[PDB]
Design a protein around this ligand. Structure first.
Ligand SMILES: [Cl-]
Ligand SMILES: [Cl-]
Ligand SMILES: [Cl-]
Ligand SMILES: [Cl-]
Ligand SMILES: [Cl-]
Ligand SMILES: [Cl-]
Ligand code: NA
Ligand SMILES: [Rh+3]
Ligand SMILES: [Rh+3]
Ligand SMILES: [Rh+3]
Length: 129
């Protein structure tokens, strides 16, 4: 599923991401924009052989099981395919664990490089929230 901007903002809010670990909703929307272009089915292979999955491009090296990332963990206790669902529950729940890991949203390199410090509220401007 390719979410609309405000549609994703609303789903993220209902699932408790607005101000989760202090990160306003716009930060989450901005991260999803540049990670996946709001597409739940996005996948990308990393140089190390791990793969990133879903709207927030969660990596198989630590967070989910895809059966093909040697030496990796599955800290979110989910198959990586669950992160590709039209239902964002699994991605949100796993994102909460990631953002709590110590480095906040810097875990998402695209957030650090493209969202951090910018006017992230723009991402939720106009949305019924
Ligand atoms: Cl957009
Ligand atoms: Cl915001
Ligand atoms: Cl594996
Ligand atoms: Cl594990
Ligand atoms: Cl599994
Ligand atoms: Cl933080
Ligand atoms: Na894994
Ligand atoms: Rh829902
Ligand atoms: Rh808010
Ligand atoms: Rh649901």
């Amino acid at each position: 599923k390719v979410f609309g901007r405000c549609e994703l903002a609303a789903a993220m809010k209902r699932h408790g991401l607005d101000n989760y670990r202090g990160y306003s909703l716009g930060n989450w929307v901005c991260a999803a924009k540049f990670e996946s272009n709001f597409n739940t089915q996005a996948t990308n292979r990393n140089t190390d052989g791990s793969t990133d999955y879903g709207i927030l491009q969660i990596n198989s090296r630590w967070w989910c099981n895809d059966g093909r990332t040697p030496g990796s963990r599955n800290l979110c206790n989910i198959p990586c395919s669950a992160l590709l669902s039209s239902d964002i529950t699994a991605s949100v729940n796993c994102a909460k664990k990631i953002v709590s890991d110590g480095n906040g949203m810097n875990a998402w390199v695209a957030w650090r490089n493209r969202c951090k410090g910018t006017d992230v509220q723009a991402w939720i401007r106009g949305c019924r929230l």
